[PDB]
Amino acid sequence: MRVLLIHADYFEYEVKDKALKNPEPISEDMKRGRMEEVLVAWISVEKVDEKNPEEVSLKAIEEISKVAEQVKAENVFVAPWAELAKPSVAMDILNRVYQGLKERGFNVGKAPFGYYIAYKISCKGHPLAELSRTIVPE
Amino acid sequence: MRVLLIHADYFEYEVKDKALKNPEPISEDMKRGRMEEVLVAWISVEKVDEKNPEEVSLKAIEEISKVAEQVKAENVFVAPWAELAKPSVAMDILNRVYQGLKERGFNVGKAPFGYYIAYKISCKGHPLAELSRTIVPE
């Protein structure tokens, strides 16, 4: 798994075209969203992660949580970021990350899966505002 | 080398604190910049790239150029993105990419090297608007 973390003043998105033929179905008010003072986590689930989706998900929860704690973000957004795992594996892992971050106490947002998505972001530019992490099954 | 390419409606930046003790010196009007209808290329120069800085630079020029041509971007911005090469190697490669993109005919912008930098970007969200490339010495 590869993760890119951006600590943002704001993040706003709008769903554009399907990237899968059978994407996640969505309601009209899921087509656009916005969060402020937010750690945006772009997650790329890789074929290697199919080896242990649970371990990888728990490592991602922990890594994302740590960074959010260090930068004092109460808000986290999980964004899928298109050697990649099958969509079912990617979807499973993404939902596990999202639910784990919710159990941790964050206000968590997520993007619909299977679409090209336009977005605006403002990265804060402090020393920890743009990080990446690589996570592999042990 | 790892490259992330975002095809953006706009990209605007402002230099914040030094990340190196001895960063690239800059004039007051280099502290902030903005481009529109622009392919933003974040480039991470890795220790492996020290093996052949020329080859890696020419491969990056070519990969970035191809994408810019495919998405019809006339404007390209080269952004450094913090296992990493020594700063002198990273600086050399970044300037070689920048100069090559200029020789190709693009309107090219670049960020000062050695700073944390705040930025705003709006990614277009079409199928080719967010790509990544890995480039290794042969």
3-state secondary structure of B122: strand
Phi (first) and psi of residue B45, to 5 degrees: -90, 125
**Residues B120, A121: C-beta atoms closer than 8 Å:** yes
Q: Could you give the residue ranges of the DSSP H alpha helices within chain A?
A: 53-71, 87-104
Nearest to A125 among B117, B125, B130 (CB): B117
Domains in chain B and their CATH numbers? 1-135 (3.50.80.10)
Phi (first) and psi of residue B67, to 5 degrees: -65, -45
CA distance B27 to chain A (A): 19
**Residues B123, A122: C-beta atoms closer than 8 Å:** no
**CA A2 and chain centroid, separation:** 11
A41: burial class by Cβ within 10 Å (0-12, 13-18, 19+)?
buried
> Residue B49 to residues A4, B4, B43, B77, B94: CA-CA distances in angstroms?
22, 16, 12, 21, 12
CA distance B114 to chain A (A): 12
Contact assessment for residue B5 and residue B39, using Cβ atoms and an 8 Å cutoff: yes
Phi (first) and psi of residue B134, to 5 degrees: -115, 135
B59: burial class by Cβ within 10 Å (0-12, 13-18, 19+)?
buried
CA distance B90 to chain A (A): 18
CB < 8 Å to A17, chain B: 126-127
